[PDB]
């Protein structure tokens, strides 16, 4: 048996999911619940100010990602609830990693720290308040956000990018709402909500209202709340079938790069000066359910807002064996392939790699010929 107390925190990757925020759209009804720009004003504890660069970096790309919902706010957009729940998760992490141990510097420090996201601002935002909790808003030097041109981002699935990804998930693309058990149930829902058949709804735009106004107390449609589970499951129904557990290939062209990325971090503590201690990266939800499904975590909900999934690398002081342990919303966790919570990083490593994606062979299997 391992004793912890010979065990010595080495690195930490924490990869999250943007704080609450404005559904991306409304639904189709006549009577929709506000949402006022008031909620965009920035929580003044959670001011840090950053620049964003791209991973040379070098000049910020542009972002392709409009919309305006009743209330008068735009659609997408975090709001100070997501705002405060980033901060609180950055304050977590200051509990675990400054505070109950002095792993990490308790002010920003730019060489323990490396910091990536995707291109979209509310990510941005979720990353400066994760950063303004974790660090009381003190640093030595300037915060430096990484980001990826939007055809190139391998932070979420990339179908626009990935040819043959798209082409192996089209079919099930187009049929996903229709298939058994998803369509009753999606029919049901759309006729208990006076839904017309004439509008184009399915359990992505459902769950994205319930969730975004359960997650900032609005008065909902009060058969939205209740159908609130059932919703989730059934989004997450059509998520797998989509992209279900048993498609390696898909999976590997989904998450592949990612998990690339995180295996490289924990390599490089085998071997100066280039040695980060934190690194971030923000995601979205569509990056953490095959994530999860990959490390054969998944609990068949939807990831919830401000989500973290959290990597610890640890060295035993006395073998010099090398352990990892995986949290999930706080939650330790036994991804497949481990003998327990506190894994071998050799296991670890060997059961990422049923899935992982170099960029070569990413390029390669993407690849029309």
């Given at each position: 048996?391992?004793?912890?107390?010979?065990?010595?925190?080495?690195?930490?990757?924490?990869?999250?999911?943007?704080?609450?925020?404005?559904?991306?759209?409304?639904?189709?009804?006549?009577?929709?619940?506000?949402?006022?720009?008031?909620?965009?004003?920035?929580?003044?504890?959670?001011?840090?100010?950053?620049?964003?660069?791209?991973?040379?970096?070098?000049?910020?790309?542009?972002?392709?990602?409009?919309?305006?919902?009743?209330?008068?706010?735009?659609?997408?957009?975090?709001?100070?609830?997501?705002?405060?729940?980033?901060?609180?998760?950055?304050?977590?992490?200051?509990?675990?990693?400054?505070?109950?141990?002095?792993?990490?510097?308790?002010?920003?420090?730019?060489?323990?720290?490396?910091?990536?996201?995707?291109?979209?601002?509310?990510?941005?935002?979720?990353?400066?308040?994760?950063?303004?909790?974790?660090?009381?808003?003190?640093?030595?030097?300037?915060?430096?956000?990484?980001?990826?041109?939007?055809?190139?981002?391998?932070?979420?699935?990339?179908?626009?990018?990935?040819?043959?990804?798209?082409?192996?998930?089209?079919?099930?693309?187009?049929?996903?709402?229709?298939?058994?058990?998803?369509?009753?149930?999606?029919?049901?829902?759309?006729?208990?909500?006076?839904?017309?058949?004439?509008?184009?709804?399915?359990?992505?735009?459902?769950?994205?209202?319930?969730?975004?106004?359960?997650?900032?107390?609005?008065?909902?449609?009060?058969?939205?709340?209740?159908?609130?589970?059932?919703?989730?499951?059934?989004?997450?129904?059509?998520?797998?079938?989509?992209?279900?557990?048993?498609?390696?290939?898909?999976?590997?062209?989904?998450?592949?790069?990612?998990?690339?990325?995180?295996?490289?971090?924990?390599?490089?503590?085998?071997?100066?000066?280039?040695?980060?201690?934190?690194?971030?990266?923000?995601?979205?939800?569509v990056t953490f359910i095959p994530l999860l499904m990959t490390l054969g975590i998944f609990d068949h909900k939807w990831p919830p807002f401000a989500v973290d999934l959290t990597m610890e690398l640890y060295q035993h002081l006395e073998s010099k064996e090398w352990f990892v342990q995986l949290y999930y919303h706080?939650?330790?966790?036994?991804?497949?392939?481990?003998?327990?919570?506190?894994?071998?990083?050799?296991?670890?490593?060997?059961?990422?790699?049923?899935?992982?994606?170099?960029?070569?062979?990413?390029?390669?299997?993407?690849?029309?010929?």
């Open positions: 048996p391992v004793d912890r107390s010979l065990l010595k925190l080495k690195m930490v990757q924490v990869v999250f999911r943007h704080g609450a925020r404005s559904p991306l759209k409304p639904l189709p009804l006549e009577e929709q619940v506000e949402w006022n720009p008031q909620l965009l004003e920035v929580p003044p504890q959670t001011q840090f100010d950053y620049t964003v660069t791209n991973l040379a970096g070098g000049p910020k790309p542009y972002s392709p990602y409009e919309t305006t919902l009743k209330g008068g706010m735009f659609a997408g957009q975090l709001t100070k609830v997501g705002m405060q729940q980033m901060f609180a998760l950055g304050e977590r992490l200051r509990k675990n990693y400054v505070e109950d141990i002095p792993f990490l510097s308790p002010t920003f420090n730019p060489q323990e720290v490396f910091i990536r996201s995707t291109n979209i601002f509310r990510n941005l935002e979720s990353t400066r308040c994760l950063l303004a909790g974790l660090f009381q808003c003190q640093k030595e030097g300037p915060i430096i956000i990484h980001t990826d041109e939007a055809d190139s981002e391998v932070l979420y699935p990339n179908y626009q990018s990935c040819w043959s990804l798209r082409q192996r998930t089209r079919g099930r693309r187009q049929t996903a709402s229709l298939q058994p058990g998803i369509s009753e149930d999606l029919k049901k829902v759309k006729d208990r909500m006076g839904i017309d058949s004439s509008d184009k709804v399915d359990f992505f735009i459902l769950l994205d209202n319930v969730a975004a106004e359960q997650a900032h107390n609005l008065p909902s449609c009060p058969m939205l709340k209740r159908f609130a589970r059932m919703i989730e499951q059934r989004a997450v129904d059509t998520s797998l079938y989509i992209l279900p557990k048993e498609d390696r290939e898909s999976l590997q062209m989904a998450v592949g790069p990612f998990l690339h990325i995180l295996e490289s971090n924990l390599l490089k503590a085998m071997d100066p000066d280039k040695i980060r201690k934190l690194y971030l990266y923000a995601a979205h939800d706080g939650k330790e966790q036994v991804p497949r392939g481990c003998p327990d919570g506190l894994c071998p990083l050799d296991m670890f490593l060997n059961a990422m790699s049923v899935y992982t994606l170099s960029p070569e062979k990413y390029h390669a299997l993407c690849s029309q010929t």
